[PDB]
Design a protein around this ligand. Structure first.
Ligand SMILES: Nc1nc2c(ncn2[C@@H]2O[C@H](COP(=O)(O)OP(=O)(O)O)[C@@H](O)[C@H]2O)c(=O)[nH]1
Ligand SMILES: [Mg+2]
Length: 157
């Protein structure tokens, strides 16, 4: 059969969890999206030549997660400061120190960057995970983030 990957998008309010998901799925940038709406979105894609099904859960099911995107916004220091909370949450619900994960720095199209690449890279390295810069507005890195996570899930086992 065709492979299915259950992915989960986590992070502080306003970082672009919904916008990133809707970019991946509907291929357009949502300028506003109810912050309390939590829902799952499905899409068939090809990644590195392999066809598969994605099941993205956009948080505002959690235990069934095979891979997690931890999102902060590069113009939102508070959202970056909060990442550890989500990291630790995931390790608790999965009851494991080994969970496929990607750190995502979103809104890289904006000029008022307060979290530099160095900081993000160092944080990611301390977790042993990749760091991907993204923009839900421009589509920069959007595929890369979600695909990298699938490659991490494939690399997981
Ligand atoms: N400029 C810019 N704005 C973004 C980006 N991603 C999300 N936003 C905006 O940030 C706000 C909150 O985004 P949203 O997806 O609802 O964040 P969420 O609470 O994490 O789900 C909205 O006004 C979005 O249009 C981005 O990459 N660039
Ligand atoms: Mg949202």
């Amino acid at each position: 059969g065709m492979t299915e990957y259950k992915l989960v998008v986590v992070g502080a309010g306003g970082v672009g969890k919904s916008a990133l998901t809707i970019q991946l799925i509907q291929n357009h940038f949502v300028d506003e999206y109810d912050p309390t709406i939590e829902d799952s979105y499905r899409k068939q894609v090809v990644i590195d030549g392999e066809t598969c099904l994605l099941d993205i859960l956009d948080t505002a099911y959690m235990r069934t997660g095979e891979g997690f995107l931890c999102v902060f916004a590069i113009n939102n220091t508070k959202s970056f400061e909060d990442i550890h909370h989500y990291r630790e949450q995931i390790k608790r619900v999965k009851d494991s120190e080994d969970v496929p994960m990607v750190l995502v720095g979103n809104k890289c199209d904006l000029p008022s960057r307060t979290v530099d690449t160095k900081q993000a890279q160092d944080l990611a390295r301390s977790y042993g995970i990749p760091f991907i810069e993204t923009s839900a507005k421009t589509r920069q890195g959007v595929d890369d983030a979600f695909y990298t996570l699938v490659r991490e899930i494939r690399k997981h086992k």
